A paper describes a structure:
[name] is a 22 ​kDa thiol–disulfide oxidoreductase involved in cellular redox regulatory processes and antioxidant defense. The structure reveals that [name], unique for malarial parasites, forms a new subgroup of thioredoxin-like proteins together with tryparedoxin, unique for kinetoplastids. The PfPlrx monomer (12–179 aa) contains a twisted seven-stranded, mixed β-sheet (β1, β2, β5, β4, β3, β6, β7), surrounded by five α-helices (α2 to α5). The longest helix (α2) in the PfPlrx structure comprises five turns with the typical thioredoxin active site motive WCXXC (W59, C60, K61, Y62, C63) at its N-terminal end.
We have obtained monoclinic (space group P21) and hexagonal crystals (space group P61) of PfPlrx from P. falciparum, both diffracted to 1.6 ​Å. The asymmetric unit of the monoclinic and hexagonal crystal types contained four and one monomers of PfPlrx, respectively. Manually rebuilding and subsequent refinement resulted in a PfPlrx model, comprising residues 12 to 179. Accordingly, we used this model to obtain the hexagonal structure. The five independent PfPlrx structures determined in the monoclinic (four monomers) and hexagonal (one monomer) crystal form are essentially similar. Superimposition of the monoclinic structures reveals an rmsd between 0.5 and 0.7 ​Å with about 160 residues, and comparison with the hexagonal structure shows an rmsd of 0.9 ​Å with 153 residues. All structures are in the reduced form, with an equal distance (3.8 ​Å) between the Sγ-atoms of the active site cysteines (C60, C63). The number of N-terminal residues seen in the electron density varies among the five structures. Furthermore, the N-terminal helix α1 is missing in the hexagonal structure. The asymmetric unit of the hexagonal crystal form contains one monomer, thus the dimer AA′ is formed by crystal contacts.
Residue numbers in the entry: 22 to 179
């Protein structure tokens, strides 16, 4: 089906929609944020993510959108400055990870393994930072090379 899959991610900076090569995310921790602008609990969760991001600045937050319209998606990216997948239908990613509801937030290690599947519920406990720092401190990352340095077919497709 895909000759090249997920070549680019996107973000808003200085009022402008920008692209970033998906190879930028090789070898990084990621936080996959499954959300939508029309979901009140997703909008509230942004405040939890912002606190998370300050404490874990090297984890790259990626918005996986479930907006109904491109305009909704754009206003969400503008307000959060997160990186995001292009606007599209990502139900297949929900199916792969058996995501039950929005918001969800998964912490992924550099080789695409799941470090914390339930991280949206974890960060809502507001008692988690030291424990998570230690979890990451104690996790031995194993490198993994991906074709074209693009990790996302492995992460999102089967």
């Amino acid at each position: 089906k895909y000759a090249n899959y997920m070549n680019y991610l996107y973000y808003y900076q200085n009022n402008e929609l920008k692209k970033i090569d998906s190879s930028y995310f090789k070898d990084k921790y990621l936080g996959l944020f499954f959300g939508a602008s029309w979901c009140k609990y997703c909008v509230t969760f942004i405040d939890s993510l912002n606190i998370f991001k300050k404490n874990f600045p090297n984890v790259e937050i990626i918005y996986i959108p479930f907006d109904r319209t491109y305009q909704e998606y754009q206003s969400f990216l503008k307000n959060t400055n997160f990186y995001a997948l292009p606007f599209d239908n990502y139900l297949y990613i929900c199916k792969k990870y058996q995501i039950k509801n929005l918001p969800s937030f998964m912490l992924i290690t550099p080789n695409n393994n799941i470090l914390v599947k339930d991280a949206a519920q974890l960060i809502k406990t507001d008692e988690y930072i030291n424990n998570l720092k230690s979890l990451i401190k104690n996790y031995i990352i194993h490198p993994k090379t991906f074709q074209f340095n693009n990790r996302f077919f492995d992460l999102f497709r089967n």
